[PDB]
Amino acid sequence: IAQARKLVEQLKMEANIDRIKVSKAAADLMAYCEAHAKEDPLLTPVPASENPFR
Amino acid sequence: LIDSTKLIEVQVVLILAYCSIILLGVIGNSLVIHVVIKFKSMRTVTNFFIANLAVADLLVNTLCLPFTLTYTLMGEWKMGPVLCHLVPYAQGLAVQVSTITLTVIALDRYRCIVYHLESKISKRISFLIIGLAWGISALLASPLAIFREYSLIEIIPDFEIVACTEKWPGEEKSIYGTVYSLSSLLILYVLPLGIISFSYTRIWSKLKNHVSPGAANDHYHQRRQKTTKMLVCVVVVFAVCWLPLHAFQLAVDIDSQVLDLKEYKLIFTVFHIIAMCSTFANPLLYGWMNSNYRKAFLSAFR
Amino acid sequence: DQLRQEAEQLKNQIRDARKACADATLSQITNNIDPVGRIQMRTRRTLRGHLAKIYAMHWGTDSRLLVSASQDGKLIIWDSYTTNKVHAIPLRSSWVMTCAYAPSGNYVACGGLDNICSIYNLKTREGNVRVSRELAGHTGYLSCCRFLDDNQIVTSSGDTTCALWDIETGQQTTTFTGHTGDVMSLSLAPDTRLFVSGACDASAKLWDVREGMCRQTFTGHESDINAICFFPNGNAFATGSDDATCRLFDLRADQELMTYSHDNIICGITSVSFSKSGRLLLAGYDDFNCNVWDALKADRAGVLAGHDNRVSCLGVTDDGMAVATGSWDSFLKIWN
Amino acid sequence: CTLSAEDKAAVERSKMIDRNLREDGEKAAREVKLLLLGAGESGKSTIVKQMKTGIVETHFTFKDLHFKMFDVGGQRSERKKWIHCFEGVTAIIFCVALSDYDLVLNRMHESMKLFDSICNNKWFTDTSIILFLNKKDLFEEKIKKSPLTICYPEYAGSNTYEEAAAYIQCQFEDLNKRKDTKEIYTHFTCATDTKNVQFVFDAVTDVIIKNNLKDCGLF
Amino acid sequence: IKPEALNRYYASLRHYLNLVTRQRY
Amino acid sequence: DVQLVESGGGLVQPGGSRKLSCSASGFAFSSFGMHWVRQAPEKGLEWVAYISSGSGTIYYADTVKGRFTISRDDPKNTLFLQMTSLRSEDTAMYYCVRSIYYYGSSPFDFWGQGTTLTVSDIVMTQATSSVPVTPGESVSISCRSSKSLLHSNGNTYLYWFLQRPGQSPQLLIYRMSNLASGVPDRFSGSGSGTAFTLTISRLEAEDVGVYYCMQHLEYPLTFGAGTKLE
Known part of the structure; x- marks a missing residue:
């Protein structure tokens, strides 16, 4: 009975949270990637002059 | 002044017999190398010794047989002075390295079965042993090229022939002709035969005097019998194949009655063919009988 | 008194809120962007010296040093640029399954089947590495451990719980309970304010470090989840399971975004990681190689082949320059 | 060149670490590692006691050979997530109580279920198994009051302990689906001198000899 | 040394030819 | 200890x-x-x-x-x-x-x-033999090198030591920038190539002694003459 009450109390707290549309969530990920794309060595190969591993 | 080899009845037979040995040798000795390269789990120190033996026996088919046959059938050397000093050197190199790596396998098996509580040898030690085998056999084959000369022999006013024959510093009856023959037999035949016979006798004794716990002692002895059948074939094939060839050369250097025969070249070819049967017999006993290579052949063929 | 029924009613009304919240998919949003194209990486360094299989590795903040653990009972710190060995710590117990590197660089931690996390001090006046503290109290094998700070460490164990420890005192402050199966992984947020854990009940939970409470629960997978990792932004994370499938979750929308699956993959996923900008997803499998996914288009961009056995550990450096991969053939490879 | 005075000294330090890792790694290759498994109170304590939380390691030496036993009992977690750490052990020791054929918490069938899983595990497809049958002096007295038909309904035989013991051993050996490359040695545990460690020495020596023969391809 | 020299004479020629045209392997 | x-x-x-x-x-x-x-x-x-x-x-x-x-x-x-x-x-x-x-x-x-x-070799030159000063004032110590101490790997190999009266030398700065453990955070090292400078902020009675700069680049190790502070 104690476990059952704890499960309900946790579920009630998790039920009442604010949510935003998936469209708004997905746009943020796109904005972050297209902003930091230039500073990604793995996407854009760097010249061998400034490559510490070659 | 002609021998039996001039007849086409025996000349056609010899080429066909030599071709079959070449055909079997190239196929058998290349499968062992292929599976080791293809499969990355077969790269083991034990399997490197067998792969080395396959390469050494591959050169024997490529070099010893076709060059010997053409010089016997044609009766003279028409390859050039450069090959007169090189072909004999290479043939001795292949034979010696093939024998050396044969006793390394016997000692490797002796160490890891009789002394089963020690540590297996590392890759670095194996590479040194393989490298030393080719280096030493290169040194021991040097006298073949040094004491070999190229000349034109004219007996009849028009009988000019080309001979790639061996000459020694001594005059008349030179002991150096017979010294090389005795040293060859006591190093390439007597010494390896004693080592592998001693090694395989101790292996047979230890396996026989072994008891397994439980009620599965009998099943161990069924598998033990096939190993005994395999150990004998290695010793018998090596001893029988290489004996008549070494004995014939020693007889010539001692007695001159052998040289002045009408069938001297026919006798030599028969003994040469027997000794060259080990080129295709080695992959059959070493690269097919063991379980590691046997399952790799079936797996790779699919 | 219908206590079980009330839980079912709460569970149902939660999923309708998510369904009413979902109005678009990333497939239609991200369909009009250019793909990354072919991505080819070559091995630059190979690190040898471990006599057994590597189970874990961790990069340093300086992006040069690298600690790795193996079942032979040794911890080795490497110098990536020169392939030198800086240290070699013998372990009391050889059954080590995780290791971590302190963000300051003064400590390393390890744990495993002995149910104890050991912390070693690297900067000593005596010139040798010695055990600084032993933390005991877990009743199951240690699965993961991460240095939250120079004095705090968070540890997940096989007894379905997570704990936060005070290294100086030696006693755990708060305990995070609520999982049903064994906890296999955890990941710390970039702001070091929240963390996420995945367990064998095929669920992931978001925990608050200070409060000790669970904020959200995610149940998208079908089998055990072995790997988990935050997005560099900190508003999403990706999980890898035993059904040969990787999934991406969003904290703000509190539901799933993308699925990374292929018809030719049947082997489970061992480890997962992100690149610097988050456009690439690195996943290691049981079929002896790694796959590079496009996190925005969900299509494969490249493969990392060259390991002869299971790829057990995988990590990306802090500046996004190199990727380190360990495996069960006792080798470490650095790709660039 | 291109190396400074301090870089050259760092390289020399790395070579010393390599030498230490090589010598202690070779030392550990001359040991024999064993794994202890059982179903609760199967008598594992008696086996360990003869040679005197987490994992327990025991060291002992017998006739110039070092053994290490790992006791993985007491870990309250599923073994599917950590059983692969023990791949490569020379042999596995399984302990069974002969007197537990009627106690229930039927528990004999529980041990048979554990034996079946470990014997046919994917990781342990080649390691041998040494089986110990404990409580011999208690099973003989208990067989005169409780018939074996309680545990095995299909058993039609005598009430003699020798007949019943042979039947129990047969059922355990017939759960092995790997009739090749995996062998099972069975022994009834006794307290006569050191016959328990003598048998383990005989079984392990047999395992090592057959392992060497497979590498050479002779077997 | 060629004999340069009847039944026994041909024996020397055969002996000389076999001596120069000789192999070891 | x-x-x-x-x-x-x-x-x-x-x-x-x-x-x-x-x-x-x-x-x-x-x-x-x-x-x-x-x-x-x-x-x-x-x-x-x-x-x-x-x-x-x-x-x-x-x-x-x-x-x-x-x-x-x-x-x-x-x-x-x-x-x-x-x-x-x-x-x-x-x-x-x-x-x-x-x-x-x-x-x-x-x-x-x-x-x-x-x-009974790289020549390291110090600017001045002696420097008179009172507590509470910033003092800079500089020494010069004949050969550039910067290596291809990006490390400059210059070290600083302090010789207190009747005492063994003590390390202050290693590799021209790093500050040794146990040294107060008022000693600063700077320089590039052949000229280097050691800066002391808020000097007190514990900084009186002789300062040496040494190079650790090649086979033999060379020190400077030494700058004395009063």
């Missing part, structure tokens, strides 16, 4: 032989390389010999080759130096210095107490 104790510093007739020992306790003696450094009664520091961990590498000063011998005994934790054919110029005070080499370490961290013996 880390300690190095020297013995064998008597008085020697010219042309004689002597034995010097260095006993170490409180640290792992087998993992450290050892240096011998001597100081003339009025002059500055000069490097003598070096022996590494495992005794694999041995280096000598060009003025002591064929005369001195350095060796170590790990089980007894002892460093000893054998001197042969002593001359009047070998009258100095000899120091035992410990050093460890890996990525991110601090060599020359601990010096011995010293033993006195009486018998």
Whole structure:
């Protein structure tokens, strides 16, 4: 009975949270990637002059 | 002044017999190398010794047989002075390295079965042993090229022939002709035969005097019998194949009655063919009988 | 008194809120962007010296040093640029399954089947590495451990719980309970304010470090989840399971975004990681190689082949320059 | 060149670490590692006691050979997530109580279920198994009051302990689906001198000899 | 040394030819 | 506690032989390389010999080759130096210095107490011999190098030491920028190429002494003349 009450109390707290549309969530990920794309060595190969591993 | 080899009845037979040995040798000795390269789990120190033996026996088919046959059938050397000093050197190199790596396998098996509580040898030690085998056999084959000369022999006013024959510093009856023959037999035949016979006798004794716990002692002895059948074939094939060839050369250097025969070249070819049967017999006993290579052949063929 | 029924009613009304919240998919949003194209990486360094299989590795903040653990009972710190060995710590117990590197660089931690996390001090006046503290109290094998700070460490164990420890005192402050199966992984947020854990009940939970409470629960997978990792932004994370499938979750929308699956993959996923900008997803499998996914288009961009056995550990450096991969053939490879 | 005075000294330090890792790694290759498994109170304590939380390691030496036993009992977690750490052990020791054929918490069938899983595990497809049958002096007295038909309904035989013991051993050996490359040695545990460690020495020596023969391809 | 020299004479020629045209392997 | 104790510093007739020992306790003696450094009664520091961990590498000063011998005994934790054919110029005070080499370490961290013996290349230049100053004022110490100390790997090999009156030298700055542990955060190192500067902020009575700059780039190690502060 104690476990059952704890499960309900946790579920009630998790039920009442604010949510935003998936469209708004997905746009943020796109904005972050297209902003930091230039500073990604793995996407854009760097010249061998400034490559510490070659 | 002609021998039996001039007849086409025996000349056609010899080429066909030599071709079959070449055909079997190239196929058998290349499968062992292929599976080791293809499969990355077969790269083991034990399997490197067998792969080395396959390469050494591959050169024997490529070099010893076709060059010997053409010089016997044609009766003279028409390859050039450069090959007169090189072909004999290479043939001795292949034979010696093939024998050396044969006793390394016997000692490797002796160490890891009789002394089963020690540590297996590392890759670095194996590479040194393989490298030393080719280096030493290169040194021991040097006298073949040094004491070999190229000349034109004219007996009849028009009988000019080309001979790639061996000459020694001594005059008349030179002991150096017979010294090389005795040293060859006591190093390439007597010494390896004693080592592998001693090694395989101790292996047979230890396996026989072994008891397994439980009620599965009998099943161990069924598998033990096939190993005994395999150990004998290695010793018998090596001893029988290489004996008549070494004995014939020693007889010539001692007695001159052998040289002045009408069938001297026919006798030599028969003994040469027997000794060259080990080129295709080695992959059959070493690269097919063991379980590691046997399952790799079936797996790779699919 | 219908206590079980009330839980079912709460569970149902939660999923309708998510369904009413979902109005678009990333497939239609991200369909009009250019793909990354072919991505080819070559091995630059190979690190040898471990006599057994590597189970874990961790990069340093300086992006040069690298600690790795193996079942032979040794911890080795490497110098990536020169392939030198800086240290070699013998372990009391050889059954080590995780290791971590302190963000300051003064400590390393390890744990495993002995149910104890050991912390070693690297900067000593005596010139040798010695055990600084032993933390005991877990009743199951240690699965993961991460240095939250120079004095705090968070540890997940096989007894379905997570704990936060005070290294100086030696006693755990708060305990995070609520999982049903064994906890296999955890990941710390970039702001070091929240963390996420995945367990064998095929669920992931978001925990608050200070409060000790669970904020959200995610149940998208079908089998055990072995790997988990935050997005560099900190508003999403990706999980890898035993059904040969990787999934991406969003904290703000509190539901799933993308699925990374292929018809030719049947082997489970061992480890997962992100690149610097988050456009690439690195996943290691049981079929002896790694796959590079496009996190925005969900299509494969490249493969990392060259390991002869299971790829057990995988990590990306802090500046996004190199990727380190360990495996069960006792080798470490650095790709660039 | 291109190396400074301090870089050259760092390289020399790395070579010393390599030498230490090589010598202690070779030392550990001359040991024999064993794994202890059982179903609760199967008598594992008696086996360990003869040679005197987490994992327990025991060291002992017998006739110039070092053994290490790992006791993985007491870990309250599923073994599917950590059983692969023990791949490569020379042999596995399984302990069974002969007197537990009627106690229930039927528990004999529980041990048979554990034996079946470990014997046919994917990781342990080649390691041998040494089986110990404990409580011999208690099973003989208990067989005169409780018939074996309680545990095995299909058993039609005598009430003699020798007949019943042979039947129990047969059922355990017939759960092995790997009739090749995996062998099972069975022994009834006794307290006569050191016959328990003598048998383990005989079984392990047999395992090592057959392992060497497979590498050479002779077997 | 060629004999340069009847039944026994041909024996020397055969002996000389076999001596120069000789192999070891 | 880390300690190095020297013995064998008597008085020697010219042309004689002597034995010097260095006993170490409180640290792992087998993992450290050892240096011998001597100081003339009025002059500055000069490097003598070096022996590494495992005794694999041995280096000598060009003025002591064929005369001195350095060796170590790990089980007894002892460093000893054998001197042969002593001359009047070998009258100095000899120091035992410990050093460890890996990525991110601090060599020359601990010096011995010293033993006195009486018998009876990159040039490093210091700007000024003496500097008079009062507490509470910033003072800068600069020394110059003949050859650039910056390596291809990006490391500049310059070290700074402090010789307090009647005391062994103490490391302050290693590799021209890093600050040694236990040193107050008021010493600053700067410079590039051949000119380097040591800056002291809020000077107090504990900064009075002689400052030396040493290079650790090539085979022999060279010190500066030394700048004195009053």
